[PDB]
């Protein structure tokens, strides 16, 4: 209420506060105290500071066991004491901004709202299928090629199955720890929730789901798969990230494909991953471009890059591609990251990385691996290229790595399978304009033999495909020679691969 | 009342049918409905990117309250939309804004908890009525938010939240973060198939469903600025505007997908449009039209011809740039002129290209010239050269001129560029290089090529000079290159044809000046026989043409001797060249 | 009424013929008319380096509304130039900018979408002390305001592309700086008004020499 | 014009500048021009830098000879022309 008639309301109370004739119990924040009171230091002494520490997990458990019955009587549901101890423990582990017991009560109360909404209308999967069948109903109405009425028939059948099963049980009217974990996995993003059977069947086939995109390379697919299975099962070291890997080998063996296949598995898109191309980081300033500017400097109030983009979605994959192409002491930021999951940015708030999968591709032993992947067992190769890495890095940073793996030069059956994959995506690119493509098996032999050399991996297969198909084929498509509808066969001449129209 | 003066009823507008139909957004509406029916903190904030449908989730929630698709507990709730500007506007005295806000709080306590308040732009609430010593709307809604008396549905942006609401941590913890992700391609198709009826009712036209799947796919692929389903709706609506004007001017009546590609080609410049027959026959004559400026060197003309034919025919690898060429040859055989032939074909201009002159980059930090300086350092706010040059012009041609001069590790930036088509500047955003033609022009093996181009076939020449380049670059980097072409030294007849090209462009320029010039073949023979040596390329040719033509020619023009409208016969002397006026 | 306190009716001025006979720039007017007939985001922003005649484009739009060269959705509109410098005039107290601006927005809602607004120097609207983008921003979003913004290229990419919400509520119309021949056509269009004001004659070789020397010797 | 529920002078005359109904002539210091008129758009291109030179010593002599009669007829005194050139020279020499 200060104005031109400046009486400010801190001044009128102030002799009553100083003389003790007013018993004013104040309560304020800890930043707001410093920012608004300790400016005006004539009133900062009138008060006495009672500090209210953040409670422990066990004190939060003791708090929730007497608040429980009030939320029970509001939502008309029960809360079972495993959900209380799960709310306190999980909210202390997986939510880093808020503080106890605000987030514990938030998980409890929102879970009870979720159970009340189950009991009110109908359960979850009924609503999932109900929204999707009304979606496909309106979309099929608007489509008046389809390949859609199959999907609507499938979802309506599954809706009828779950509706009859719901009538057979006519459920959840308590709050178990499963509902707390569902509300935690919708708060933050970390899949803490219990694995429903489709996801568990998907996750036991991790290697089978990844070898549709990474052919060969068994050891690293195993390592990646074991890290994610430990994370979902609940055995990962809770004071470190999920998996801190270091990939090694020649050029074009699927390193960035293994990371893009991780992202396409786990988040259903290739470029949903914090990607730090470490080859911009050749000087010691890129430290500042990932942790941000310090106070006083230019990009302070715009943040860092690694810190902010992980703190948005705390469960993600981090790729540090071409990790040898950096200054050697950019890997001390990663010492903090890989040992404890904490990275303090410029502004002072510590982003938590204990749910991210840090992956570092490289090529540091390419000469050695290309020389000796034959006639050597995998353990001795890992040993000797780890000696090479010890010539590169410092023994701090490679002690923090969860597993160093070795990639190997691709054989000819590998390049046959890769040629099949690249041709499937070429069929997808040319089906959209309206062209159907087959291929002779003799022609695939020409692709596998014209795109093989041991030193460059599986990129010469890609540009051999590019030349020996895509240059005459796009030559003919622009020529108007190849009309859609008819199947474009890929047959060979004596050395060429010609397209025909029959 | 003090609500009707200052709020806007959304359920009344949904009942009147003014709102957009909201299709999709299942789990966002469901989690918001869960957070609204809590005991304490009935406060969902919808934190998402700008454009992804954060308001439309709230209006879809109002439409479900109208239709009855909500649970029984929310049937009949009045979604009121707060207006911060309507509160601040009439309050300049001490305590009029706070009076209005306390009146709103008393009415929303009076409404029996039957009101779901809504604030788009929650940060406007954060700094709302804050004057010198005034209770803003943050500090006055701050008690009635922690007790669930106010059922406020916020909405804010993902980066505006960091600026304004994480500044004030108590009002930051009043709200629950319901995150609204940018939708996928299929969901954008479904969202457009919902809203097709509204744009057809407005523009009085029809929209065909191939144009909708084309709008969603092309907007997801090419436009990097805005987001889904906003940019796809923009392509739909601007194409419908275009068809409505082309009906209404003086023909079509249904939006096709090529209309969507036209609006995309006008927004960006990437030629996604259908090939007209003039441009398609122009494009099949790629090699001949590059040999209308670059005679000689058939190989890379074939290579770049094939690359642009792939780019236009849709066979281009969409996770990579269009072509990533390396040019290797003796000095002065038209490498830079092959790139200028590219720019002159592609954009109908000569220096219409992003031209990095890599002999400036002889140390490790001109890397930082091309990307920019990080946070904290000097050239932060000015960006980078390459990143602004490509972000402002997506479909361009990048020339790394004279790429042998630099430090050996400037070409790691290019590892990112040539592998995935992306490059992160200092300010933390990536530029999409899925549309450029990255071209490098070295001369690492000009001694070897000038020595042994004779008696060695082209494949083994490429093999040998590529082995030398393998000694000079890293195996990671030559693996990324699309096609390492090799340039051959010029012959005599090639230099004669180059001189013919120079004379014809000189005659065209001086005809634009207003003159008419003829020449005898003997002058051409003298020009071909005087300035020949294979070691120096076609530049001694052009400077000999320069001297032995343009010194007497400009000597005689400036005297007024050459009257325009005559015939300038470039005859010869016993040893030199002189022009006459007959 | 708040419009008459702060707006300038351009079409009423072109009705009395005070404006310039804008000749050329036809495709930019056509793209602006494409933008102003959408459903949402009806708000073009004219963008180019300064001096190239963007207010001239909106004057030509107003003259086409007066003559009737517009489609059948713009006959009868009024083009009102808003003055962002005039709303931040008496900015003493709290909530006095918002009173003026809400008066303008209520009176524009009163006309039932009949008024094209022209907010020149659009970089003023971002920083107004929250302030001014956040009262226009929902009405800009729904397309019930038809704000023809007009700002410099560098001011646009410094002020408005920093702020993504206000950036997507507009639509760019890039204004190409005219050629030498187009400047000659402009001066041949505007020769008569200057010869009827100065009461002198102007020699057309001096016109084409003036355009050529101005393009050559001033950067 | 810092008023209440009202307008100032500048943003009420600003319509009359770009409407042709004002033949205004301004006068200001260079610095306040370079802050307050170069920053605006319409106020910039409705105004022209007629720069005023600080005059020379003999020009000041001519001006003082043009105004010697007024001050002499005012104060009933007489002014000497060597006193004029001494005053002008020492005023430009000493006063800052
Ligand atoms: N095992 C594989 N399965 C399928 N495609 C593969 C495989 N290995 C390589 N490729 C293809 O070859 C390309 C090159 O592989 P990348 O992983 O990108 O190279 P890299 O492994 O990153 O090695 P560097 O050192 O980064 S060049 C990939 O993008 C795929 O298109
Ligand atoms: N699920 C959806 N159903 C229908 N229309 C949608 C949907 N999502 C987005 N839209 C449309 O997308 C456009 C923009 O969405 P908006 O919510 O208005 O943007 P926004 O989410 O408000 O983000 P800001 O912060 O206002 S820029 C509108 O035309 C909406 O109708
Ligand atoms: N086939 C050709 N047709 C026309 N002009 C050509 C041809 N080959 C070379 N030239 C001329 O060669 C001259 C020099 O070409 P540039 O490409 O600029 O030199 P360069 O190829 O870059 O060699 P370096 O190593 O960079 S010095 C140009 O002025 C061209 O006119
Ligand atoms: N096509 C045109 N027809 C007629 N006059 C034009 C044309 N283009 C520009 N002009 C004139 O050029 C001048 C430019 O006027 P303005 O539009 O105010 O300037 P501008 O191009 O908008 O640049 P700014 O950023 O507003 S200073 C005026 O005298 C116009 O009459
Ligand atoms: Mg890689
Ligand atoms: Mg919004
Ligand atoms: Mg060159
Ligand atoms: Mg202007």
Author numbering:
A (entry chain C): 287 to 430, 441 to 466, 527 to 858
B (entry chain B): 159 to 408, 527 to 858
C (entry chain A): 159 to 287, 293 to 382
D (entry chain F): 287 to 382
What is the paper's account of this structure, in its own sentences?
We studied the disaggregase ClpB, which contains tandem ATPase domains (AAA1, AAA2) and shifts between low and high ATPase and threading activities. ClpB is composed of tandem AAA domains (AAA1, AAA2), an N-terminal domain (NTD), and a coiled-coil regulatory M-domain, which forms a repressive belt surrounding the AAA1 ring (Carroni et al., 2014, Heuck et al., 2016, Oguchi et al., 2012). ClpB activation requires two signals: (1) interaction with the Hsp70 partner chaperone and (2) binding to substrate protein (Lee et al., 2013, Oguchi et al., 2012, Rosenzweig et al., 2013, Seyffer et al., 2012).
To allow stable substrate trapping, we used a ClpB-K476C-DWB variant and incubated it with an excess of casein in the presence of ATPγS. KC-2A and KC-2B differ only partially in the orientation of AAA2F and show otherwise identical features; they were therefore defined as KC-2 and are described together unless specified otherwise. In state KC-2 the pore loop of AAA1E engages the substrate at the highest position, above AAA1D, while the pore loop of AAA2F is dissociated from the substrate at the lowest position. In KC-2, substrate engagement by AAA1E is linked to AAA1E activation as the arginine finger of AAA1D fully moves in. In KC-1 and KC-2, the nucleotide binding pockets of AAA2B–AAA2E show clear densities for ATPγS and receive arginine fingers of their counterclockwise neighbors, defining AAA2B – AAA2E as active. Similarly, substrate engagement by the AAA1E pore loop in state KC-2 is coupled to substrate dissociation of the AAA2F pore loop.
